[PDB]
RNA sequence: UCCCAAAAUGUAACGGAGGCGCCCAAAGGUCACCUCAAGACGGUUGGAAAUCGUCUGUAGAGCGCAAAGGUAGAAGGUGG
RNA sequence: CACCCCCGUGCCCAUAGCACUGUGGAACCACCCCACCCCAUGCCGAACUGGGUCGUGAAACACAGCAGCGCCAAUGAUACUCGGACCGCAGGGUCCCGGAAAAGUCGGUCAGCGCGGGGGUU
């Protein structure tokens, strides 16, 4: 990801395959432009959850993590990106998504395990160590078993910033 | 389908979409690339295709009800005022809005429980899969 | 007669003439007697030098300056920062 | 008549049980009051006065006709209509007449055990929904008209329930264990 | 509770008037029989009872009225305007008053 | 009186909604004073709401009628 | 404005508000005390009110910490639009040119500014 220009002038970009976005934390915002497709096939995999070497042009690597992001309705594609300069020690929060594995003991009984809250977000993640995902069991469930935030086994460290109570997954009965 | 209980008529004015998000409730989903006024009957006629091709599951979710009632002619004269209230019930959809997005079977299993229901809308769709990640 | 209900039902004949706003703008000179501000509750509360009809108007004590201050909102004045 | 062993027993017990940083912190009473929610069911321009004059000579107070919320509910109801009747007491009358129920009253009540325990206004203010007006030191069938009932209110400057059952039953209370 | 100090206060109208308001703490027997001026923020006089009382609190009810009154005179105040607050014109207060309302 | 009416005013339609042909010795003038709806916990006929009590409680109430604007430092609620 | 704190009263009037926590007492304040009548609660001197300690600081208040909730709130891109010029049979839409949100985010704060009176620097 090496962006380079950042004018507050597009032209030489909204036609040329770039996104546009900006990246900061409270000292630097500086002004921001880099490419289309990689940003495209980036983020893709990092997520937000996932820190990138920012090399703008001239040479100033600066690490960041993906905010928030805003793409086209008509077109799937995107169009606007937020990065938040990575920190240190904290960097404020993170929105984190359940993951499901081994089967179900739901499933196969006969319903289906619906998992209620897709991304989970958590209080104080830590910077350099912030889980770029999130397993969570499944098996134990049945015919209206519930898991929530109490229940997810932490990274160490990591604080749930959503409440406990909250269902994170269900396995569904039939029909 | 139809509301429980309101004013009773309105209007007509349109513009691309604005509250119609994209993931959430599941893994696919449909999406409405055109300005078009979604008939409730015309999404039974999506929902109840969806279900035959579903056996169980569910994981079917129509977030498009229909907030809108227009009228019609009740013969032809035209000396009267206002008529029909009780004509039908709608949903003006506009472009990238989500009528649809199932969950839990497999992606074929539901580029077809889409495909189906497209046959009966009459506007231009395209299924969705994730990435979709912006207010929770 | 016959056993049914006066006059139809469910019309839409007829409303009301009807005015209000404001008749004098910040800056402007007022004077003595003019009026302000023709509203329907306390839009703009008689700020300092106006004085405020039965009906919530607005008009001037003596001669000088339109002036406008809104705290946000909620409660407006009219005061006049007369010229002399 | 009281107060002295009010504080004595109350207060110095209190510390002397407790622990408060000063006197008046510990918990005491701040009024004891009386509706006469009668009417309603029996609407007598008549009744009401057996209320009054009555309620009167026990509390040794004229109560006020807390009258209708103006509420017309399906049934019989509608804007202020005479309905309850508030008595409250404090200080004076309301030891005077308190007393006279931690001695006459409850002590003189026929198919009396004592008092339910558990916290009322977790506010530490306690609860007295009186019953049957028969077990009154000043109830007189033979010399009123029909019989009734009321309800008390304790207000107590507890700020826990714990330390108001104290006070409460120190001051003097019957509880059912 | 504040309503009858904001019901009076704001009762008594402040540059319209051009007059001055005359306020008092009487709430407590520390009363402060202030007297400011409508615009600037600013107090004139004020006699209160604060420089000793002689023991007199709820007694020296006219002293603050009477050492206020003259008080405004080394500087020459005819018209003013009672400014009360809670204390509904009652006596311990009415005092200040009469014995200013005459004190001037 | 609301919407249409296209953020000044004004603007139609056998366009969409709803009221008036009064009422008040005081529901006025003035001077005082109080302040709501509602839920929760606890309490007698009560037991759904409602009477009492205690917390929360910018008002989610009120304003004689239709609606809107307005309003608790009251135009809300009592008395002289 | 010599340093401070306390009381009253403004400007301002939620970035100045809540809550949780601590500080203060005999200068001030408050509770508290009694209250027959001045005057008073459609019952209650609870509140208004009159005459006053001790005791307290518990409550009310004032200060102070804190931000978990409130309130404030970027930048970037955007919605939309004055003007200019185009497309689609129609629903609707685009380009150039200024204007440009709202929400969200970065972050921001638990004010600041006066007048006067009291008491202190044993």
Redesign the pocket.
């Known amino acids: 990801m090496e962006l380079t220009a950042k004018?507050?002038?597009?032209?030489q970009k909204?036609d040329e395959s770039m996104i546009?976005?900006?990246a900061?934390?409270?000292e630097n915002?500086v002004?921001?432009a880099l490419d289309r497709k990689a940003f495209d096939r980036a983020f893709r995999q990092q997520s937000t959850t996932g820190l990138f070497d920012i090399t703008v042009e001239g040479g100033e690597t600066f690490p960041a993590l993906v905010?928030?992001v805003?793409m086209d309705k008509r077109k799937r594609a995107p169009?606007?990106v937020?990065f938040?300069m990575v920190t240190y020690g904290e960097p404020?929060?993170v929105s984190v998504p359940v993951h499901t594995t081994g089967r179900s003991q739901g499933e196969v009984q006969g319903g289906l395990v619906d998992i209620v809250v897709h991304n989970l977000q958590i209080v104080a993640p830590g910077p350099r160590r912030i889980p770029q995902e999130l397993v969570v069991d499944v098996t134990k469930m049945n015919i209206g078993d519930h898991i929530t935030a109490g229940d997810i086994k932490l990274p160490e460290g990591c604080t749930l910033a959503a409440d406990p109570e909250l269902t994170v997954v269900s396995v569904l009965p039939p029909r | 389908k139809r509301t429980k209980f309101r004013?009773?008529?309105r209007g007509?004015?349109?513009?691309?979409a604005?509250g119609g998000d994209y993931v959430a409730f599941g893994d696919y989903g449909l999406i409405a690339m055109?300005?078009?006024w979604i008939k409730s009957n015309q999404i039974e006629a999506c929902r109840i295709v969806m279900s035959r091709h579903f056996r169980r599951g569910g994981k079917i979710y129509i977030r498009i009800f229909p907030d809108k009632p227009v009228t019609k002619k009740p013969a032809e004269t035209?000396?009267?005022?206002?008529?029909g209230?009780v004509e039908y019930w709608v949903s003006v959809v506009?472009?990238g809005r989500v009528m649809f997005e199932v969950a839990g079977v497999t992606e074929e299993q539901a580029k077809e429980a889409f495909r189906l229901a497209g046959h009966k809308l009459?506007?231009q769709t395209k299924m969705v899969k994730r990435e979709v990640y912006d207010?929770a | 007669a016959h056993k049914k209900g006066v006059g139809s039902?469910?019309?839409?004949?007829?409303?009301?003439?009807?005015?209000?706003?404001?008749k004098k703008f910040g800056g402007e000179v007022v004077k003595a007697g003019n009026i302000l501000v023709r509203?329907?509750?306390?839009?703009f509360?008689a700020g300092q030098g106006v004085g405020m009809g039965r009906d919530?108007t607005l008009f001037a004590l003596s001669d000088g300056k339109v002036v406008f201050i809104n705290?946000?909102k909620?409660?407006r004045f009219i005061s006049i920062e007369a010229a002399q | 008549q009281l107060?002295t062993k009010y504080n004595d027993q109350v207060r110095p017990a209190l510390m002397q049980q407790f622990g408060?940083?000063?006197?008046?912190?510990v918990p005491r009473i701040?009024?004891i009051?009386?509706?006469?929610?009668?009417?309603?069911?029996?609407e007598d321009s008549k009744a009401i006065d057996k209320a009054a004059k009555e309620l009167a000579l026990i509390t040794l107070?004229?109560?006020?006709?807390?009258?209708?919320?103006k509420?017309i509910?399906?049934?019989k109801?509608r804007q202020?209509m005479?309905?309850?009747?508030?008595?409250?007491?404090?200080?004076?009358?309301?030891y005077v007449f308190l007393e006279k129920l931690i001695n006459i009253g409850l002590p003189r009540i026929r198919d009396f055990r004592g008092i339910?325990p558990?916290?009322?206004?977790?506010?530490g203010?306690?609860?007295?929904?009186?019953?049957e007006q028969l077990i009154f030191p000043e109830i007189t069938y033979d010399m009123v008209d029909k019989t009734r009932?009321?309800?008390?209110?304790?207000?107590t400057?507890a700020?826990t329930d714990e330390e108001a059952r104290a006070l409460l039953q120190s001051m003097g209370l019957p509880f059912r264990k | 509770?504040?309503?009858?100090?904001?019901?009076?206060?704001?009762?008594?109208t402040?540059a319209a008037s051009g007059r001055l308001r005359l306020?008092?703490?009487?709430?407590?027997?520390?009363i402060?029989a202030?007297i400011?001026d409508d615009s600037?923020?600013?107090?004139?006089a004020?006699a209160?009872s604060?420089?000793?009382k002689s023991?007199?609190?709820?007694?020296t009810?006219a002293a603050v009225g009477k050492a206020l009154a003259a008080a405004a005179a080394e500087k020459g105040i005819k018209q003013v305007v009672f400014?009360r607050?809670?204390?509904?014109?009652?006596?311990?207060?009415?005092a200040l008053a009469d014995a200013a309302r005459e004190g001037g």
């Not at chain 4, 009051?33 to 029996?42: A, D, I, M, P, R």
């Not at chain 4, 203010?125 to 019953?131: A, Q, R, S, T």
């Open positions: 004018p507050r002038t597009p032209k909204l546009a976005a900006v900061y934390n409270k915002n002004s921001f905010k928030a805003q169009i606007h937020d938040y404020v929060e | 004013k009773q008529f007509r004015m349109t513009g691309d604005k055109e300005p078009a035209r000396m009267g005022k206002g008529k209230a506009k472009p009459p506007i207010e | 039902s469910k019309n839409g004949r007829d409303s009301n003439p009807k005015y209000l706003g404001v509203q329907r509750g306390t839009k509360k919530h705290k946000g909620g409660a | 107060k408060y940083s000063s006197v008046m912190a701040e009024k009051v009386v509706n006469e929610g009668l009417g309603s069911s029996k107070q004229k109560p006020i006709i807390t009258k209708a919320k509420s509910s399906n049934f109801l202020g005479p309905v309850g009747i508030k008595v409250t007491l404090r200080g004076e009358r309301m339910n558990n916290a009322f206004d977790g506010r203010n306690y609860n007295l929904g009186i019953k009932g009321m309800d008390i209110t304790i207000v400057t700020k | 509770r504040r309503k009858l100090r904001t019901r009076r206060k704001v009762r008594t402040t306020s008092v703490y009487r709430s407590s027997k520390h402060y202030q400011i600037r923020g600013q107090t004139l004020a209160s604060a420089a000793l023991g007199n609190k709820t007694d009810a400014d607050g809670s204390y509904k014109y009652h006596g311990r207060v009415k």
